Design a protein around this ligand. Sequence first.
Ligand SMILES: NC(=O)c1ccc(-c2cccc(C(=O)O)c2)cc1
Length: 242
Amino acid sequence: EWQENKSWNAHFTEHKSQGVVVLWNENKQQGFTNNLKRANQAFLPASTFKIPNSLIALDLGVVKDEHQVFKWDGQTRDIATWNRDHNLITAMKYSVVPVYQEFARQIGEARMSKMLHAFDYGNEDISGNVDSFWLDGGIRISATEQISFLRKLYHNKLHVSERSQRIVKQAMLTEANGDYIIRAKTGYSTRIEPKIGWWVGWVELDDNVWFFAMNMDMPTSDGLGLRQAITKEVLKQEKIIP
Ligand SMILES: NC(=O)c1ccc(-c2cccc(C(=O)O)c2)cc1
């Protein structure tokens, strides 16, 4: 079941923004959104693709564990935190594209395609460069499809090892306190219009889990913080978090 709650539209417009938030109550098996159509609108995943990319790299032995160090290749890029050594945890944290492009080249077209078919991930189309298709290739995924994929990961039901799924869920850790845990990944798609931002993941409570997927128009990088801020306004209104 899916319910549209148009009162949530204010969380976008009052931030001078436009987008969709999708929530899924795991215990009750019910979904909610401010915009049913945009909840099903398919976009480039951009850096949210680091979730499936991590899983594939781990399960094929491209990445040995969350401590293996991926050396900076010495090229100075415009994002300062990219110009250093990383492991899987910090590469996720800082959304280090060049590390994951190396992952993708080592995975290769055939294995990448097979894995995304097995994951039932979006349109399963990797057309483009093997090392940039999630940024300017043919792959597309909607917010509700992100939730489908995340629910499989949470329950260790994807067609990779349990170990691989546990490690990626560790690398997705974003916030934790006495009230909730958030495991999630941001995305920022700029190479093809429309420019958008993503935030997808879930909120762990003592007695339930709330999955979420949001995207929003992102004409400038100045609004990137709104990905989390808008989502948290929805979570607070629904009393999922204080
Ligand atoms: N102007 C830009 O092209 C640009 C590109 C990427 C980032 C970035 C880098 C690291 C983490 C995140 C993030 O959202 O978590 C975003 C910022 C700015």
